[PDB]
Fold this protein.
Amino acid sequence: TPYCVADYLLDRLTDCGADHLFGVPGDYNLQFLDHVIDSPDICWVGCANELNASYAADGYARCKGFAALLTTFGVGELSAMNGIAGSYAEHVPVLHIVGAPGTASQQRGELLHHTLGDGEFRHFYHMSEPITVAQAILTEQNACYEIDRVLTTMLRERRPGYLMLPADVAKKAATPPVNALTLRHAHADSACLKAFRDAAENRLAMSKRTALLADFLVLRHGLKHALQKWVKDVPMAHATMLMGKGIFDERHVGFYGTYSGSASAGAVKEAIEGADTVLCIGTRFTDTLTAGFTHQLTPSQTIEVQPHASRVGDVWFTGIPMLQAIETLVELCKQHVHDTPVPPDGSLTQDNFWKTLQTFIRPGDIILADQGTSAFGAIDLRLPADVNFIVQPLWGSIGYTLAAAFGAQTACPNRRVIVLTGDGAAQLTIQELGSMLRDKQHPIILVLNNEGYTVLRAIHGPEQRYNDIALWNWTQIPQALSLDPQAQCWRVSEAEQLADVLEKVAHHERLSLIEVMLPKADIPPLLGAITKALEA
Amino acid sequence: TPYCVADYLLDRLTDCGADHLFGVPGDYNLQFLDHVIDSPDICWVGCANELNASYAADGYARCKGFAALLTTFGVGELSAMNGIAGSYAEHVPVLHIVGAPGTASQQRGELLHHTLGDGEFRHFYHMSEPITVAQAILTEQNACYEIDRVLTTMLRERRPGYLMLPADVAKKAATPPVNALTLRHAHADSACLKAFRDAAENRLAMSKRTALLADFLVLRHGLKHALQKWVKDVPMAHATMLMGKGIFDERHVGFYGTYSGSASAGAVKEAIEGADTVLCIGTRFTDTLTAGFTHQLTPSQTIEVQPHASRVGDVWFTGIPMLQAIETLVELCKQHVHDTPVPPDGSLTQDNFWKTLQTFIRPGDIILADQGTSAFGAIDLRLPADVNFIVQPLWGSIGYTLAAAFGAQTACPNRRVIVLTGDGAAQLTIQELGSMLRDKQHPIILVLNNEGYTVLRAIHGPEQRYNDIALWNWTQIPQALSLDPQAQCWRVSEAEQLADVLEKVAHHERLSLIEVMLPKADIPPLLGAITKALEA
Ligand SMILES: Cc1ncc(C[n+]2csc(CCOP(=O)(O)OP(=O)(O)O)c2C)c(N)n1
Ligand SMILES: Cc1ncc(C[n+]2csc(CCOP(=O)(O)OP(=O)(O)O)c2C)c(N)n1
Ligand SMILES: O=C(O)C(=O)Cc1c[nH]c2ccccc12
Ligand SMILES: O=C(O)C(=O)Cc1c[nH]c2ccccc12
Ligand SMILES: [Mg+2]
Ligand SMILES: [Mg+2]
């Protein structure tokens, strides 16, 4: 077992922050998996299918800052395509390792299984190009620096990368590196940074009331602490949108609720849109986040900070790291921001469900909500400190959270994980619940059983049968997907019953599945505003 | 409800032979679905996820000759990518309809859900190019002739196509066509056909013993009856490989078993490889079908017929439709081939399981077997007449069989469907069993419970943990995935119990799930040869 390319990749992978590798084995990657098994630093996590594995890697990376997925050539990697695309869309650094047939077999154009039967072995590599920031076909002549290049780009951009690893290349001799892979964040040219500072210094100097709006890019680039410390040292009205929920302790002074354009609470609209200067840090104004692009923020009103560039008014300042821009604005806020913000039921409904959940969440919780009434209602939760709130409203692939929850719980075995998934969404990835049980995880899984696609019903055709789903027996799924599930399941239709059940499962001694019975047409306030925006 | 592009596409869909549309709804395709519901010729079949829907469409198309899949932009289509790729690899005409945001939204580059957040709306269209024979983005200016062009190419090549249908385009006015879309077989240039005929006649005229080897391209191009009548009117030794199993009644004189290269039975090797002239009709010598490319057939020994070209010896004759080449060979064979063939246990093992299943299969069965010991053991079944045998050994995506069975049963509600899936494979697509139960299907599902991936164990690392799977409670899955399942499940560990249970379920009164307990290391004969070939 001499040190080889397979070991080098695992060594670099652990340097980047991944301690687990998710995926599904295949004959093209079994020999690589031996090194995964033998490594003391990386733990193999076999998944029930590749799509769920890619979702789990995404959720893992939202907890540890990095993740890796292993699939087999062809059938495996294409199954994971939707997961990698979601990671690219929402800036999640997931490494996709594809175990591939040996280079000799590829060069001969053999009619191998998991190919299109044409002797071409690069179709799927090229198909992955639009959803990765970097990719490589590893060869005996390039392996170690292509591994380092792809991973470094992933770290810089916080987006997926792709490595094709032929079985023969994986065994090629390598040398253990003396230096661990690190990025060492870059610095702007001092004249460019000064130009941004001077324009920002001027703009803040004439600001009467300043507000701060931060979102998911600060989460991806490890700037959560900086934004939290920013608002302590300089108290001002601040919010996030749905994607960036969890950046701020929502109990803190100056927070009035999540910003969702015209669907925001009145206090939030006045806090953010009513300020004459709004600092937008890592924001992307998507249709869902803005309730149909109904946000009212003008270029003159805003200073915007993006990963490699920042904007003051109509002028863009490129080549400025987002951390350096933030550090620059903090200084300036200290110098120019003065203000002090001066701040149960019977039958289950959306309204009393989220109110009941509000009393249940605690600091340290990991909360995942799927597209549907789950995410659109969870936006109204007031998150306490140290909450990781995982939602995917830009890509918006239902089924993500259940599988992502398995990844997040794997990343954080000592934290309480709350899974809010609709009944429709959970069907898409249900087999990963078996993975949860096999690994003895204890998440609190709340299935919003409104018997179908309620969000689709509210958009169009409420009585149309294509908005119906097969009706599952949710509380019996754990006993079907495990020979001995240590799980406790309830079906609840009353709020007091839900509150009592939430008390029982508070300390997550066992996996809990709560089937929440909700009306077919019952709607959270944000989605009602969203549906109203879609008319004309 | 004026006739529009949505109605035109559905009308063309029925012309091609599809009575159902599989998929998963999304906001970008809800208005199109209204026309599917309202259509008297197309039945909407909602699936549990897009990957399964694409597998079901594939299995449907293998029964009706054509199928259609509907997904939503981005999250839907990328989930189905592995299914469409398998359809391309194995030449299955599945039409992928992608409901997309309106053209106005696309041209402004809006930050819409199900995008990468860059305003680009053609990423996924291009990513689908390598796995389709034709694709189009439908516009107001091209819709109806682009629909007809894509479908015609799909019919010509028997391979998937792709249509992007913006919601606004779907509502554009159209006119019902007077004439149904038809292919109208092409004809070879008569001099080109004559040249092939002269070369084939010379070769066959000095053939002492002639044999016929046919495979899956005969199935896809609707030539199963022609091949059957061929060997009836002209008795000779004949076989198929694994992909094309089901072309011939295997009880008939001249059939000695499936051909698998050096893994073939001794009589099969002598019947096919022992002939001085072998007619290879629609054959692709993949690694699995030939047990590691160990087939012994020389160019001078063979005459080969492919969809658009045929070969005699070392000379290729291009531009000849495969139907015309076969008709030429049939005439020549009637003249020049001077031939006449003239011909329970205790504990469950692979050996007695397949012998027990042999006594159970009947004419008219649809049999599906997944990659693993299932497909590799089913190759030894002696199929009676009128059996549709569905296997995917070129693409080889596990999980395909369970979902494709749902599609095949949908296509043929009056036929008995037998599903042979491993425990590993069924985990990948288990939620489609819920679709089976919702639609009151009565397949016979045999789950080969060997507690892990034994095919991978045979290949490499028998005791390695990556070859293990989560252990499910298979007989309890139907009652978890349906509120009132019409099903009966059994668990069997002895050959007599299996035969007894197969006795009970004979007439598919209800959905049957038989959990077959088999040893971890037990291997069917074909897979033993394959692993031996791997040692190279
Ligand atoms: C992979 C994928 N397929 C399809 C969709 C389209 N879609 C978005 S929301 C939704 C329905 C949500 O259903 P459910 O999870 O039951 O939520 P709720 O009823 O609370 O709205 C669908 C089908 C999607 N987002 N992702
Ligand atoms: C989508 C996909 N992922 C992974 C593989 C790799 N693969 C091929 S066969 C196999 C194991 C088959 O397991 P099972 O279905 O239990 O069959 P067995 O050999 O145990 O009967 C695997 C993982 C594949 N073919 N397709
Ligand atoms: O992991 C993979 O590559 C597989 O799908 C396993 C497999 C399915 N069919 C085969 C034929 C020969 C070798 C491996 C496989
Ligand atoms: O079916 C679809 O298109 C969906 O993905 C549902 C959905 C999730 N988030 C949304 C935001 C606006 C409109 C639809 C959706
Ligand atoms: Mg629902
Ligand atoms: Mg198995």
Notes: Chain B has three domains: 5-170, 190-336, 350-534. Residues 190-205 of chain B form the longest helix (16 residues). The pocket of 3-(1H-indol-3-yl)-2-oxopropanoic acid (ligand 4) is lined by residues A 288, 371, 396, 455-456; B 26-28, 72, 113 (CB under 6 Å).
